[PDB]
Design a protein around this motif. Structure first.
Motif, PDB file in Angstrom:
ATOM      1  N   UNK A  98       0.785  -1.232   0.000  1.00 13.38           N
ATOM      2  CA  UNK A  98       0.000   0.000   0.000  1.00 13.38           C
ATOM      3  C   UNK A  98       0.822   1.291   0.000  1.00 13.38           C
ATOM      4  N   UNK A  99       1.871   1.416  -0.818  1.00  9.28           N
ATOM      5  CA  UNK A  99       2.193   2.738  -1.361  1.00  9.28           C
ATOM      6  C   UNK A  99       1.475   2.911  -2.688  1.00  9.28           C
ATOM      7  N   UNK A 100       0.884   4.084  -2.890  1.00  6.04           N
ATOM      8  CA  UNK A 100       0.023   4.252  -4.055  1.00  6.04           C
ATOM      9  C   UNK A 100       0.793   4.275  -5.369  1.00  6.04           C
ATOM     10  N   UNK A 101       2.128   4.327  -5.337  1.00  3.99           N
ATOM     11  CA  UNK A 101       2.888   4.166  -6.569  1.00  3.99           C
ATOM     12  C   UNK A 101       2.917   2.719  -7.044  1.00  3.99           C
ATOM     13  N   UNK A 102       2.661   1.759  -6.152  1.00  8.06           N
ATOM     14  CA  UNK A 102       2.585   0.360  -6.558  1.00  8.06           C
ATOM     15  C   UNK A 102       1.190  -0.003  -7.050  1.00  8.06           C
ATOM     16  N   UNK A 103       0.192   0.797  -6.696  1.00  7.37           N
ATOM     17  CA  UNK A 103      -1.177   0.497  -7.083  1.00  7.37           C
ATOM     18  C   UNK A 103      -1.336   0.643  -8.595  1.00  7.37           C
ATOM     19  N   UNK A 104      -2.265  -0.086  -9.212  1.00  3.19           N
ATOM     20  CA  UNK A 104      -2.537   0.119 -10.636  1.00  3.19           C
ATOM     21  C   UNK A 104      -3.027   1.533 -10.904  1.00  3.19           C
ATOM     22  N   UNK A 105      -2.961   1.924 -12.178  1.00  6.10           N
ATOM     23  CA  UNK A 105      -3.285   3.297 -12.548  1.00  6.10           C
ATOM     24  C   UNK A 105      -4.733   3.640 -12.221  1.00  6.10           C
TER      25      UNK A 105
ATOM     26  N   UNK B 239      -5.514   4.101  -8.375  1.00  5.16           N
ATOM     27  CA  UNK B 239      -4.985   5.366  -7.882  1.00  5.16           C
ATOM     28  C   UNK B 239      -5.772   6.540  -8.448  1.00  5.16           C
ATOM     29  N   UNK B 240      -6.239   6.418  -9.692  1.00  7.63           N
ATOM     30  CA  UNK B 240      -7.064   7.468 -10.285  1.00  7.63           C
ATOM     31  C   UNK B 240      -8.376   7.612  -9.524  1.00  7.63           C
TER      32      UNK B 240
ATOM     33  N   UNK C  45      -8.946   6.736  -6.368  1.00  6.55           N
ATOM     34  CA  UNK C  45      -8.621   7.307  -5.065  1.00  6.55           C
ATOM     35  C   UNK C  45      -8.384   8.808  -5.171  1.00  6.55           C
ATOM     36  N   UNK C  46      -7.683   9.241  -6.221  1.00  8.34           N
ATOM     37  CA  UNK C  46      -7.478  10.667  -6.437  1.00  8.34           C
ATOM     38  C   UNK C  46      -8.793  11.383  -6.694  1.00  8.34           C
TER      39      UNK C  46
END
Lengths: 67, 81
Positions: free
Chosen positions: A8-15, A18-19, A21-22
């Motif tokens: 759960x760092x959001x750089x590891x999450x799929x695009x 994360x989109x 969540x943003x």
């Protein structure tokens, strides 16, 4: 400890995740907090009788939009 | 899409910096890695604090300005100003 460190760092999450969540975070943090004041102007415009003497009512005075 | 891509790349770079720099101070490393240990919703809400002048978010100026331009473009479209 491994889960906290490397999961759960959001750089590891799929695009797309994360989109989404943003999108939610942007909504709550920015769109809800965005404040603009219009109520006085809106009520004044609604309370204004619009060109009543120019308009041919030939009767009792018409109620304003606020009324 | 591109805003999140840039934000993710920046958080990758910052995590790399922390993994390089943890050895000077072990105690400060916990404060650095609180962001990465937080749940992803908390992480994005933390990264999205560059509104107002509190400005404690770990976000670069250019990524900050991208959204601080898109937001007023959106307000202009919505008719706010």
């Amino acid at each position: 400890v491994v889960a906290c460190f490397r999961m759960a760092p959001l750089y590891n999450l799929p695009r797309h995740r994360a989109v989404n969540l943003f999108l939610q975070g942007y909504e709550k943090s920015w769109i809800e907090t965005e404040e603009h004041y219009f109520e006085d102007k809106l009520i004044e415009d609604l309370a204004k009788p619009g060109a009543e003497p120019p308009e041919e009512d030939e009767g009792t005075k018409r109620v304003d939009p606020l009324h | 899409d591109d805003f999140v891509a840039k934000l993710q790349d920046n958080q990758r770079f910052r995590y790399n910096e922390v993994m390089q720099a943890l050895n000077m101070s072990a105690a400060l490393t916990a404060r650095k890695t609180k962001e990465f240990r937080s749940p992803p919703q908390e992480q994005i809400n933390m990264l999205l604090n560059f509104k107002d002048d509190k400005s404690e978010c770990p976000c670069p100026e250019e990524i900050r300005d991208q959204l601080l331009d898109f937001h007023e473009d959106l307000m202009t479209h919505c008719g706010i100003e």
